[PDB]
Structure formats: C-alpha cells, structure tokens
C-alpha cells in the first residue's frame, strides 16, 4: 500500500506522501561537499566490499562507540535489513516488530520464514513502546527486536529509560536489537546519539538518504560486532556484492559536510511543524497528532473514528494534486503521514487544499 | 589486492573520468536529481538495452544492481517446496549457490574439457524433472569461454518446454565475441517464452563497479521481480543508471579496444602453448573475458603453482580448484598485453620448478 500509493502518484506536483526531504541535484550537493574534482580519478573497479575507508571513517566519526571496522556499507538499509535477517534466521525463530513502522521491517522476515509478533503502538499512548507489553512478546526463540527510532511514521524518539528496559528484555532472552536509526540526523542537539554502544546485542542501521536530500544515492550501513559483520559481509556477495565507489564517495562527503546540509533542513522542518500546529488549531479538534520529536515525517489523524483517510486522501490528490499517505499503509485508517522536509510554501499549500476538502 | 591481477573476470576497468571522455555524459550528471530512480530503470537505459535486439522492448526490462541482484530476485520469486534447478558447472558460483541458500535442490551437470566444456543435451535431459523450474544457461561461459551453438540451444529449449521449466540465460559476456565479423552476440530472449535473459555492462565495458545489470522476461516475471526488489535495494542510483546508459549508447567507442586486447592475449597464449610443448592446453574460448586452460601433467596442482606465482612474482591466477577442476586455472584476457606477457613469462619460470 505504501508502494501502491507513492508510485501511482509519483509525478503529482504537491507530494507529501514520502519520508525523504527535498532531494538535491548532483551539482547542488557537490557544491556543498566539494567532492567534484576528485570523482574523475575514482576507479570503476570493484569497491571495498565493506565500503571504502573514507565512508566508514565518516560514519565511525559520528559516535565514540563506533569504530571504522564495525561498519558494513550496503545499498540502502533495505539491503542491510535483508542480509541481517537472513543471517539470523533459524527454524522456530520469531521477531518482535512495533507497528506502525516501515513495512520492510516485518515483511522481509515473513519472506524469510520468521514468526512475526506485532506490538501495536497507538496514538492514545503517544506511539510509545511499553516495555511491560514488549516483554509479553519476547521468547527464547525471539532473536530480533526491531527498534525504529526515530519512528517512521510517528516521529517519536524512544526515551533513555525505554531504551534501558528494552536492553534488559533483550539481554534476558539473548535477543538482538535491530536499531533502525535512519532519522537520527534530524532532531527537532545536533544529532541523536547512536545506540550501538549501549549493549552488545544492539545492531545499528544508518543512512544518508532521507536526512540529507540524497535518497537516490542508495547508501546505507550496518554496525555490529565482528562476527555479525563477517556473516553479513559473506551473504552480501549473493545480493549486490558491492556498492559503487561514486555513491560511496559522494555519501562520505555528505557526512563530512553535514553542517552545510542538516541545519537548513532542520529550519525547514521547524517551520512546517509550526504550520501544522496552526492547522490543528484552525481545525478545532478535527485534526490531532502525537507531536514528532525527530525525523522527516508526522502521523496526524482525524479524531472522528468514522473518517477514512483514504477517502480524503483520494479526493485531495485528484482534485488538487496533493498527495498524503493514507494511514491504511500502516493499518491505522484514521491517520495519515505527512512529509516535513518540504518547502514550507509547498507544505502550506497542501494544508490549504486539505482544508478545502475537509470543508466540502 | 596484488598489483598484477589476472584472476578477475572483468576487463581493465576505467576511472570515471576515462569512461566519461568516451561516452560524453559528464556535463549531464550535475542536473540529475537525487530522488529515487525509476523503479524499472530509466527509460534512457531501458531503451538503450532494448535497442540491442529486435526481440527486446523497453517494457520487458528490469534494471538491477548487477546481475547478482537479478539472480537473487528471480530465484526467490520462483521458489517452491520440492523445486530443483539444473546448473552446468564450472560456472559463476552465484548461479548455483544462491538457489541453494533459497532452498532449491541443485543438480549439477558436469562439463568437461575432454568434451570441450559443451552441454550434452541427452545428459542434460536426464536431470530435468517436472519439478525442475529453472535451467541455467550461462553463454558465453565463465570460465571456459564457450558459446552455446544454435543446435545446442534448440535442444535445451526442447527439454525445458517439455518439462515446463524456464531457462535462465546468463548472457553477461555477449558484448565480447572473439570473431572479427559480428560485433556482439544476439540475445537468446526471443527464442522461446521459457527464456529469461540477464545482461550487464560491468565485465565487458570496464566498469564493473557501477553495479548495473538487467533482467528480461515476460510481463508476469517482470512484475513479480519488480515487486520483490522492494525488499532488496528498491532502486539503483540514477547516476549509475545514467552512466551505464551512455556506455551502451557509445559501445563502439569502448568495445574495440577490449576486443583487440583479448585477441592479442589469446595469440600470446597460443604462443605460450607452443613453447610449453604439450604441457599446457586449453579449450580455445569463443567469446568473453576469460579462459580456462589446464596442465596436461596429472601431477601438477594449479593451486600450488598459483600460490608460488603470486608470492614470488605478484601475479594472481585463479586456480581451477575454485571450480572443482584442480588442473585448470582461470586467466583474464581483458588486461594489457604487456601485463599478460609478464604473467606468462613468470608462470613459465614457476613451471620450471
Ligand atoms: C525507517 C526506514 N528504514 C529504512 C527504509 C528503507 O530506505 P533505504 O534505507 O533503503 O533508503 C525506510 C524507507 N522509507 C520510505 C520507503 C523507501 O523510500 C522505498 N522503499 C524501500 N526503499 N524499500 C518510506 O517509508 O516512504 C525507512 O522509513
Ligand atoms: Mg568513532
Ligand atoms: Mg528492441
């Protein structure tokens, strides 16, 4: 459903249904990172099968708990999720996935034969993970606990105490924690710290794609102990083998020049959060949300349980060209996902047309 | 990481600037948006691929991150319990290892140098069940260089269609025939509805690192592979996509240099065979970037000779034990002839001991 909507309306002029920020052109990004003149001397032979040292050092430099040898660069975290769950699969294993979340986090394990146990997060509870309700789902057969923080679609950041309880549940059942830290670069602190150092059972996923305006580079990474890195590196030979030295190199300069990129998008998000709080006040209780704390998305809802966002989302895109992602893509029919990393004129235009559809 | 690597199956790879000076796509890259690429691959790339064969249309193609991803997705969607796949060996290890990870039963068709590493269709038909879902047809062959003949293809088509099995034709090296007349080998995709074709610019055009390949099939297999690619990489970069498209559109500015290097090295290796006076032989390759010669002495272990060669001389050959052919070794033809000749003289020195 997430792919059904975002592909059918990929070319609409007012697209708020995606989770990436406004993407650069290659020339725009190179004017900020300064990596242009170095590209022509890059060899088109196979890249380092872990990713180049330049990229792994830039990733490792972000956290004192991370060293360059802990990192395996992948073609987005979509590949990293696939290889990680493949390596961890055994017969009779289950995984715990809080939902709403990115569909790949529970659909890939289902394809691989895992038993998938869902922890339904709810807006009434602030989309927060209750560790006593999480502890009900964790077996000795539970091998992976998915921890998407900042959350897609809600934007909720796990608190330090929530993390400590989840660490305790995982270590008790000897389960690993797959911490998808995609949106750590856009707090609403400069960046959120990685969870990789907090427990030996934590494996971290990261990427430049959503936060830096370069989703198309297809660069992600996995952080883990040497044994899980060796096992994932082995199986990546049967997925894509390597990523291109150019994508690798361009993403490295992005992280090394994050100060030229992330603040401008933070200001863009902060204005749009204000624009949506204005919209919530004007709607007088019809629209509410769990306020997001970090990332690129929000998951507001109609307070009337009868309204289907898909019906409102359909009329909005056909009559006005404005795309919102209906919450059915997350099994939350009253919610909808809205993109925060867009130009505020575009964000406000969408609210103005959404108001028109609400009236009529 | 040794400096004199003849163990790879790619040709001498360009730098990005060297490749762009031949295709002319440099100035166009800066206006490309870093939003998601077309989830089928760009039209420019899919049209450039389709233009190579009259049987291929732009809508038949799914661009992937190398054929490694195409192999993974194709075998994944086709898997069912009790299925088997038939793999002629020696071949590229992914062609039988990925189906093994996915739960397929793998039936190996042993190819032999005595028979020229050619496919025996009557012995192949002994391996094909009603449970056989895929028949792997890597032509030109890695490592031998063998090109499947027109009659061999029709026999394989006959066995597959009789048992309702599909044919996975890994046509990676179709861009480097060794005969002077034809420029590139034709795609097998038009010959039967059971044929799914894999291609790539990587090994033949000196840009293996771009990670660009493609899969060709009927709309249901294209729709099914496109669906599962959402769980592998979703898309390939618009930049790599765009560069590979310009490579295909300017193949005439690229392939001739590699053709001359391969034939020059085949000639140098034929000279080396004459000097060795029967100790070295090979099935002469017909197309591609590699050869699979062997020692005629049953006592020589290529792994030992390859080991001494790389430690004392810095020259890497791929020992045939990697293909369960201990007397063989794989040597790269797409290197500079001066490097190819350096390797032969040093391999001769190692042979004298
Ligand atoms: C937390 C989180 N982790 C990982 C990924 C995968 O993104 P990536 O790491 O592979 O770039 C996403 C992707 N969110 C996008 C979908 C992609 O844009 C398209 N679908 C695939 N790429 N499979 C969206 O939800 O709208 C995500 O939100
Ligand atoms: Mg560090
Ligand atoms: Mg055509």
DSSP characters over B6-26: ---SS--PPBHHHHHHHH--T
* Gap between the Cα atoms of B167 and B159, Å rounded: 10
Task: Answer whether A212's CB lies under 8 Å from A15's CB.
Answer: no
Query: If you measure from the C-alpha of residue B213 to the centroid of ligand 3, how many angstroms do you get, rounded to a whole number?
Result: 17
B312 touches ligand 1 (CB under 6 Å): no
The CA–CA distances, whole Å, from A155 to A76, A149, A243 equal 20, 8, 29
> A182 CB under 6 A from ligand 1?
yes
Domain housing B211: 16-252
Give the C-alpha separation, B249 to B263, whole Å: 24
* Entry field: residues in chain A: 360
User: Which residue out of A182, A213, A222, A337 has the highest number of ligand 1 atoms within 8 Å of its CB and is therefore the one to mutate?
Assistant: A182
Residue B33 has φ and ψ, to the nearest 5°, of -80, 140
* CA distance, residue A279 to nearest chain B CA (Å): 28
Residue with tokens 């559109």: B249
For residue A328, what are the CA distances in angstroms to A100, A120, A283? 10, 14, 22
For strands A94-99 and A142-148, give the pairing.
parallel
DSSP H or E segment with residue A41? none
Asked if A344 and A271 touch (Cβ cutoff 8 Å), the reply is yes
CA-nearest residue of chain A to B33? Answer: A25
End-to-end CA distance of chain A: 26
Strand, coil or helix: what is A241?
A: coil
Q: Report which DSSP code applies to A74.
A: E
Q: What is the spatial distance between Cα A268 and Cα A271, in angstroms, rounded to a whole number?
A: 5
A7/B16 Cβ within 8 A: no
Distances (CA, A) of A179 to A120, A202, A349, B41, B323: 18, 7, 35, 31, 40
Residue contacts between A and B (CB atoms, under 8 Å): 142
Q: How many other CB atoms are found less than 10 A from the CB of residue B167?
A: 24
Q: Cβ(A313)–Cβ(A326) under 8 Å?
A: yes
Residue A83: count other Cβ atoms within 10 Å of its Cβ: 25
Cα–Cα distance, B12 to A106 (Å, whole number): 42
Tell me if A242 and B211 make a contact (CB, 8 A cut-off): yes
Which of B16, B209, B234 minimises the CB distance to A39? B16
The rounded distance, in Å, linking the Cα atoms of B143 and B288 is 9
Q: Compare CB distances from A104 to B19, B98, B231 and report the shortest one's residue.
A: B231
DSSP secondary structure letter of residue A256:
H
Neighbours of A46 (CB within 10 A): 18
Phi, psi of B351 (to 5 degrees): -65, -40
With an 8 Å Cβ cutoff, are B233 and A218 in contact? yes
User: What's the Cα-to-Cα distance from B134 to each of A146, B72, B80, B104, rounded to whole Å?
Assistant: 35, 13, 12, 10
- Tell me the structure's resolution in angstroms, rounded to a single decimal: 2.0
Nearest alpha-carbon partner for A292 in A272, A322, A262: A272
Residues 6+ apart with CB under 8 A from B327: B294, B295, B297, B298, B300, B301, B302, B320
Among B6, B11, B65, B75, the strongest candidate for a mutation testing the A interface, having the largest count of A CBs within 10 A, is B65
The whole-angstrom separation of Cα B43 and Cα B58 is: 7
Q: Measure the CA–CA gap between A31 and A138, rounded to whole angstroms.
A: 48
Residue with tokens 């939350």: A332
Ligand sitting nearest the alpha carbon of B186: 3
**Helix/strand/coil for A176:** strand
Q: What are the φ/ψ torsions at residue B209 (nearest 5 degrees)?
A: -75, -15
Nearest to B208 among A25, A30, A46 (CB): A46
Whole-Å CA distances, A340 to A16, A212, A296, B73, B215? 8, 13, 5, 33, 36
- Give the integer Cα–Cα distance in Å for A94 and B142: 40
Beta carbons of B350 and B309 less than 8 angstroms apart: yes
Q: Which of A357, A350, A284, A352 is nearest to A315 (CA)?
A: A357
Tokens at residue B184, please? Answer: 């590139």
Q: How many angstroms from the chain centroid is the CA of residue B101?
A: 21
List the alpha helices (DSSP H) in A257-343.
262-283, 309-320
> A247: domain CATH number?
3.40.640.10
Q: Which of A287, A97, A117, A266 is nearest to A179 (CA)?
A: A97
Tokens of B309: 């060669």
Distance (Å, rounded) from C-alpha B125 to C-alpha A245?
Answer: 43
Hey, is B156 helix, strand or coil?
helix
């Amino acid at each position: 459903l997430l792919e059904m909507w975002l592909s059918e309306y990929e070319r609409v002029p007012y697209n708020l249904g995606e989770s990436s920020v406004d993407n650069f052109t290659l020339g725009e990004l190179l004017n900020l990172t300064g990596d242009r003149d170095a590209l022509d001397q890059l060899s088109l032979m196979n890249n380092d099968t872990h990713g180049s040292l330049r990229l792994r050092e830039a990733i490792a430099s972000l956290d004192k708990s991370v060293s360059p040898d802990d990192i395996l660069v992948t073609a987005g975290t979509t590949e990293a999720i696939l290889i990680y769950f493949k390596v961890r699969y055994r017969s009779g294993a289950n995984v715990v996935v809080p939902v709403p979340t990115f569909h790949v986090l529970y659909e890939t394990p289902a394809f691989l034969g895992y038993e998938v146990r869902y922890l339904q997060l709810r807006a009434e509870n602030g989309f927060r993970i209750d560790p006593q309700e999480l502890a009900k789902l964790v077996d000795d057969n539970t091998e992976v606990i998915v921890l998407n923080t900042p959350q897609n679609p809600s934007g909720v950041v796990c608190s330090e105490t929530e993390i400590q309880s989840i660490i305790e549940i995982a270590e008790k059942h000897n389960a690993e924690i797959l911490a998808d830290e995609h949106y750590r670069f856009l707090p609403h602190t400069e960046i959120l710290p990685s969870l990789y150092g907090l427990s030996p059972k934590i494996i971290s996923l990261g990427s430049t794609g959503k936060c830096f305006g370069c989703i198309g580079l297809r660069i992600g990474w996995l952080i883990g102990n040497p044994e899980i890195i060796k096992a994932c590196h082995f199986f990546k030979d049967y997925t894509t083998h390597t990523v291109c030295v150019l994508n690798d190199y361009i993403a490295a300069g992005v992280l090394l020049h994050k100060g030229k990129i992330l603040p401008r998008y933070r200001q863009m998000i902060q204005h749009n959060i204000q624009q949506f709080e204005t919209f919530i006040k004007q709607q007088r209780g019809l629209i509410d949300w769990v306020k997001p704390e970090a990332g690129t998305i929000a998951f507001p809802f109609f307070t009337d349980p009868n309204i289907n966002s898909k019906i409102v989302a359909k009329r909005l895109v056909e009559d006005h060209g404005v795309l919102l992602l209906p919450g059915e893509a997350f099994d939350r029919p009253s919610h909808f996902r809205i993109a925060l990393g867009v130009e505020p004129s575009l964000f406000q235009y969408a609210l103005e047309k959404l108001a028109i559809v609400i009236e009529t």
